[PDB]
User: Which sequence fits this backbone?
RNA sequence: AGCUAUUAAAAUCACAGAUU
RNA sequence: AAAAAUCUGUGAUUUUAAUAG
């Protein structure tokens, strides 16, 4: 005992406190192991190491590993060649005697408690319970004091903004690790060692150790492999902002020592390339600073991922449209000549003409809506109410907008009290009202883009998820359609800014002939047209106090965007019996078919849903771009490679990053999404399936393959890991095999950002499929928003249907020999919809009879409900409609002496008319 | 009681908004603060207190005229 | 016009009961069939105007009602509020309105970050005693704290030797300034 | 065309035989003629409605086409005024100067107004930030010197520079909007 | 020998509800 | 000055289809 403890102490140190004595200590640590019998990224228990604490240093553990003498000597040969570099911890080699055997020992000096893998794993598998590893690492590294954790919500990004400040202090750890990785790989090539380097070999300090599986070779021409080292760490280095030290401009715009000409620079191509060769030297694959040089769709995702990581070092004022001098009718101008994207880089127009005269409507229309001329000819602006960058203000000055309350319907309310509603028994009461807003409702709601942050995907895993999510959309068809064949439902709607100052969308759709619409559309396939959205406040009944804004995209964006997508979008609503439900009705038994189809085929079923906190604001840029790439993948014959790129840029330039006009000031939007896009309800759906699949892939990799017995799952895990981190091309044979495995055990029902899942319960408990504890993990490092467990639900039995879908509860009833589901709403919504109205003339019901019809159609399902109070909700609406019709008929008789016949309209206060709408076939 | 209070204050902002209190933000941020909080309140005792604070402000704008509620 | 067809219908349908020659009956029935066809056209043309008349009357009745309501919204809404405040059983609303009906009414009310500020006009000593109790103002169902008092062009009352000396001697009205003790 | 006259002539002959008791051998021929004349009249009359409804279709289309021309000519002439209204505001002397400094003659759009414009609007939230921006009454932004010319509070009323001191700052209606101008 | 009536469907226009 | 979509209700005009005279 003591004799062995003597030598481990070393020949030049002392003060080692034994944590477990001469016996090894059992501990749980994360590993990234690929082997003939296992391929996992989880954590394993290890027994071979004795750990000792050094008392003098802040955090220094003497760890000694004992193994067969041959293995100890093998490491010594490897260490002796590598030791002269600056990335290897001090090793000491010796052997010790036992009563009947000899065994070797390898002693490491001053190794920190946790490897780099534990930091990465602890952040990519996160839940507010059993989080002691992440909490521990913060304290020892020195990011925050222990008093910080006293706050019960310290971990919530959208409620504790200071958290992003704490993580940034870990940025030095991550950045320091990489610069020591490139130094180590260089030693490998020179000294001639072949091996695979991974995170679990590295301390938090940056030193490498535990290289027992490396093999020797001739000096020089060594081979290091680092696909899994960088890939697994990618979300962390973007979440922790590790490249802050590389900021190009280190002066404040408001400082008196600033210079003017510094703002002009826009071309940072050389700067980005220098970083790549500095940190990712041995990454292997090519990297094109400007995505216009890429070859495939997979390369555009690959390069655009790096650009999002390197965009943190570029000034915020360098992005946006690039404008140029121009001549119109002989007088000068400033007009768009390109664009500078955070993701895609710099793109130049292929068509710009510097001299124009006798403008046609097409030239006149795109000149007027292009921000270049209006932004340049107005004063500057500094708005301290919002974090978003903003420089412009109308010559007329700024203004403000308020929101007025609703109008109270006295006659209907008195009717409810007479019937017995709203009694002090507290059965039902009003919950939806018309809320007012202060003068700054718009800008202070645009400020919520603060939550948008530059997330970075681990590209080695987003390749496979991009393949699987695409398989869900292979049923539908798509292509380009001529302007003669488009369909528009509402011509009486705003055309955006500044075109709305002259007329609504109908005026422009008839002033532009078909040939001029196709001329403009063909022009957009080779040029970029920036446009402005306008923030307008929604005025409708709500149950929550916060105001909600919706942007109206300029006409030239939607007029061209839907002509490019209309054929694909209309196919999603015509296909029936698929994952996307956007086109299915809830009447005529549609609700029963939707649920009965979802539940069919899943063994041992369970039911769950989930919620995205602030989806519109926190949606990452990278995953919104991919949603535009998947929906455009159908254009295979009608467009060449370059035509699809310039149609992708036009979507990013007009929707993702925009010049937003609100209350007389133009602001530069940082990202996210806007509800006014032509692909809103369908671009959300693709993102929704991206998170659901990405949660499956993330967890399936982490299950200990050494104890799995479902051979089909065991083989899938090994093929999945091999296809991600150890292959250059995805074999589509596996994807069809894995996609056919989700459809049997993880069936889905998706509709925009609202969806339901029916999943095999036995597999989820073991971890072969996603689970609510897995959706917390994927959102934290892919959306950096915390998904509180109280906002989602689980229903362990299918007889009750989903708890809540599309804001409507579900009930199951038995009738004759058949049993079916029925949706019914929240009762307070139907009653409150009549008491409070948004227009004064609606206070008198007799003017609008048809408002309570078509509102009792939604209330019929309540008639089947158990609670007698809920039953009254439907029958009161029938009496109310009866009261109105008999009042109008007698009123017309007295006033004009003509009697209306009641027989034709007597079907509206009998439940037989309403029941026909929830009858199958 | 409670549902009468939640409806007797929707008409108050209707009277105040018609009287053009929206011109100056300081007095419109005071009313909208009460209007929003009174609607969400569940305790009838507290909801009454806010209504009286809003009602007292309304009288200050010289809008009493003839009263039948002696 | 329709009476002609009915007279022919009654006679010719009854003719079946007598021994009229079949060949004449065939012609007689043919004429009756034509008359019935004409009657149907009269019914369709007449009633198509009748249903149009009903629609026009109902449409204009709704329009007349709608335009009538919008012409008196502001005055009507004030009555709506004061009719609603009666339905409440609380006595607090009665106290405020009773004071307002009296000679004591509030001046401008100032929101503030620290505490709201009140200004109250007290025309007579009785009005001052109404709201002032224990050295504090009891208005709007809350305790309001007095800071300073203002005379008719003066502040001499500030010493608060006011209960009897000032009522007989000095002029009125008397104005108070207060702040809310509890912040909402 | 003359079918109606032919039918009327046949009708006259038909009654001019029946009313006096003409032999049936002639009446039968006339009755056949009436069927021919009436049926021919009806078929020709069927064209009248087709022509009439095509005439109204033509009238609706012509008016619709004519109205569309007026609307199109109105908007384009309105956009010329807007487009040439903005051309009058450009300070192209200042803008062109920076375009020479740019290496390739191109500059970001989000930087032109902040570098070349002559007026700046600053919205301040708290006096803690006001005194951070203002120094001796001048503001520096984008490495350029601006001086304060005008101030307006949230309500839209004018505020004096001497009125923004600490004690009176609490009374003001923040946010406070400053209007600045450059000195060259 | 082609003309009149009642239902069903499609299209256009107008208004009104619910959902993300 | 009040957005992108899906579903449903009422009314008016036109056409088509079926049955009856
Ligand atoms: Zn590339
Ligand atoms: Zn295409």
Assistant:
């Amino acid at each position: 005992d003591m004799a062995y403890l003597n030598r481990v102490r070393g020949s030049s140190a002392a003060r080692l406190e034994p944590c477990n004595g001469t016996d090894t200590q059992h501990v749980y640590r994360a590993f990234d192991i690929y082997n003939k019998d296992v391929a996992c990224l989880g954590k394993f228990l290890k027994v071979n190491c004795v750990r000792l604490k050094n008392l003098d240093k802040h955090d220094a553990f003497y760890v000694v590993k004992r193994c067969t003498k041959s293995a100890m000597e093998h490491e010594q040969s490897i260490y002796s060649r590598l030791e002269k570099c600056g990335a290897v911890a001090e090793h000491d080699f010796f052997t010790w005697k036992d009563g009947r055997a000899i065994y070797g020992n390898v002693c490491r000096k001053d190794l920190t408690e946790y490897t780099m893998m534990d930091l990465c794993y602890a952040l990519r598998n996160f839940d507010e319970n059993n989080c002691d590893v992440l909490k521990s690492i913060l304290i020892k590294v020195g990011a925050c004091e222990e008093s910080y954790f006293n706050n019960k919500v310290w971990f919530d990004p959208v409620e504790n903004e200071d958290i992003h400040r704490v993580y940034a202090l870990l940025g030095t750890i991550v950045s320091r690790a990489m610069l020591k990785c490139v130094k180590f790989c260089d030693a490998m090539v020179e000294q001639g060692i072949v091996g695979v380097v991974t995170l679990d070999n590295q301390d938090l300090n940056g030193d490498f150790y535990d290289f027992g599986d490396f093999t020797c070779s001739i000096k020089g021409m060594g081979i290091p492999i680092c696909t899994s080292y960088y890939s697994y760490m990618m979300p962390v280095m973007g979440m922790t902002n590790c490249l802050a030290s590389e900021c190009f401009v280190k002066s404040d715009i408001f400082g008196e020592d600033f210079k003017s000409y510094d703002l002009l620079e826009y071309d940072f191509t050389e700067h980005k390339t220098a970083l790549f060769n500095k940190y990712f030297k041995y990454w292997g694959l090519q990297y094109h600073p400007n995505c216009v040089d890429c070859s495939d769709e997979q390369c555009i995702v690959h390069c655009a991922n790096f650009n999002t990581l390197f965009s943190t070092t570029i000034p915020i004022t360098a992005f946006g449209p690039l404008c140029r001098k121009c001549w119109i009718d002989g007088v000068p101008l400033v007009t768009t000549a390109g664009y500078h994207f955070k993701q895609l880089g710099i793109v130049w127009n292929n068509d710009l003409n510097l001299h124009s005269s006798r403008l046609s409507i097409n030239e006149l229309l795109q000149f007027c809506s292009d921000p270049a001329l209006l932004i340049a000819s107005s004063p500057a602006l500094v708005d301290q109410r919002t974090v978003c960058f903003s420089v412009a203000a109308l010559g007329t000055g700024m203004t403000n907008q308020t929101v007025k309350p609703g109008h109270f319907n006295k006659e209907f309310y008195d009717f409810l009290l007479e019937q017995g509603f709203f009694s002090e028994g507290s059965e039902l009461t009003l919950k939806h009202f018309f809320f007012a807003q202060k003068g700054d409702a718009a800008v202070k709601d645009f400020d919520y883009y603060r939550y948008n942050r530059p997330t970075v995907l681990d590209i080695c895993q987003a390749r496979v998820v991009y393949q699987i999510v695409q398989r869900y959309f292979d049923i539908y068809e798509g292509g380009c359609i001529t302007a003669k064949e488009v369909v528009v439902t509402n011509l009486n709607k705003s055309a955006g800014y500044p075109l709305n100052k002259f007329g609504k969308a109908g005026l422009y759709y008839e002033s532009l002939s078909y040939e001029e619409q196709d001329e403009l559309y063909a022009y957009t396939k080779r040029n970029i047209l920036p446009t402005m959205t306008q923030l307008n406040l929604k005025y409708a009944i709500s149950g929550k106090e916060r105001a909600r804004t919706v942007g109206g995209v300029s006409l030239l964006s939607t007029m061209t965007t839907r002509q490019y997508h209309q054929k694909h979008l209309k196919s999603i609503v015509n296909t029936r019996g698929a994952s996307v439900v956007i086109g299915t009705t809830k009447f005529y038994g549609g609700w029963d078919n939707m649920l009965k189809n979802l539940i069919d085929g899943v063994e041992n079923p369970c039911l769950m849903g989930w919620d995205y906190p602030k989806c519109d604001r926190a949606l990452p840029n990278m995953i919104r771009m991919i949603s535009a790439m998947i929906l455009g993948s159908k254009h295979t014959t009608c467009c060449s490679s370059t035509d699809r790129f310039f149609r992708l840029c036009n979507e990013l330039a007009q929707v993702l990053t925009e010049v937003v006009y609100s209350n007389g000031g133009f602001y530069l939007k940082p990202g996210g999404t806007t509800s006014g896009d032509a692909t809103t309800a369908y671009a959300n759906s693709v993102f929704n399936i991206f998170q659901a699949v990405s949660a499956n892939v993330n967890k399936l990799l982490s299950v200990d393959s050494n104890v799995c017995h479902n051979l089909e799952v065991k083989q899938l895990q090994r093929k999945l890991y091999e296809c991600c981190y150890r292959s250059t091309t995805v074999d589509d044979q596996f994807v069809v095999e894995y996609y056919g495995y989700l459809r049997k055990h993880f069936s889905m029902m998706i509709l925009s950002d609202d969806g339901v899942v029916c999943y095999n319960n036995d597999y989820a408990s073991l971890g072969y499929v996603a689970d609510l504890n897995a959706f917390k993990a994927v959102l934290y490092y892919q959306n950096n928003v915390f998904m509180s467990a109280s906002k989602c639900w689980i229903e362990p039995d299918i007889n009750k249907g989903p708890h809540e879908f599309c804001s409507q509860h579900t009930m199951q009833i038995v009738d004759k020999d058949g049993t079916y589901y029925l949706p019914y709403p929240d009762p307070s919504r139907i009653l409150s919809a009549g008491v409070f109205v948004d227009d004064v003339v609606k206070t008198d019901a007799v003017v609008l009879l048809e408002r309570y019809v078509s509102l009792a159609i939604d209330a019929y399902p309540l008639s089947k409900h158990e609670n007698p109070e809920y039953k009254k909700v439907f029958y009161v609406l029938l009496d109310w409609v009866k009261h109105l019709y008999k009042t109008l008929n007698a009123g017309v008789l007295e006033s004009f002496s003509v009697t209306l016949l009641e027989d034709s309209t007597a079907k509206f206060w009998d439940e037989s008319f309403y029941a026909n709408m929830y009858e199958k076939s | 009681k409670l549902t009468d209070i939640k409806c007797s204050n929707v008409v108050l902002l209707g009277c105040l908004s018609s009287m053009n209190v929206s011109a100056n933000s300081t007095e419109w941020a005071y009313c909208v603060d009460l209007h929003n909080k009174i609607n969400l309140c569940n305790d009838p005792e507290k909801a009454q207190e806010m209504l009286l604070a809003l009602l007292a402000f309304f009288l200050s704008k010289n809008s009493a005229f003839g009263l039948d509620d002696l | 016009s329709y009476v002609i067809y009915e007279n022919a219908r009654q006679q010719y349908e009854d003719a079946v009961n007598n021994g009229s020659p079949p060949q004449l009956v065939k012609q007689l029935r043919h004429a009756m069939n034509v008359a019935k066809s004409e009657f149907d056209r009269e019914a369709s043309t007449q009633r198509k105007l009748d249903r149009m008349a009903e629609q026009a009357a109902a449409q204009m009745y709704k329009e007349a009602r709608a335009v009538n309501r919008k012409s008196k919204v502001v005055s009507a809404m004030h009555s709506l509020l004061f009719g609603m405040l009666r339905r409440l059983d609380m006595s607090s609303v009665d106290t405020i309105l009773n004071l307002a009906k009296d000679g004591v009414v509030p001046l401008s009310v100032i929101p503030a970050v620290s505490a709201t500020k009140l200004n109250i006009v007290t025309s007579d000593i009785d009005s001052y005693n109404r709201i002032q109790r224990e050295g504090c103002v009891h208005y709007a169902g809350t305790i309001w704290n007095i800071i300073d008092i203002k005379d008719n062009d003066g502040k001499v009352v500030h010493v608060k030797e006011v209960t009897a000396q000032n009522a007989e001697s000095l002029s009125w009205p008397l104005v108070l300034g207060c702040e809310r003790i509890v912040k909402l």
About this structure: The interface with chain A takes residues 53-54, 57-58, 60-62, 64-66, 69-70, 73, 80 of chain C (CB under 8 Å).
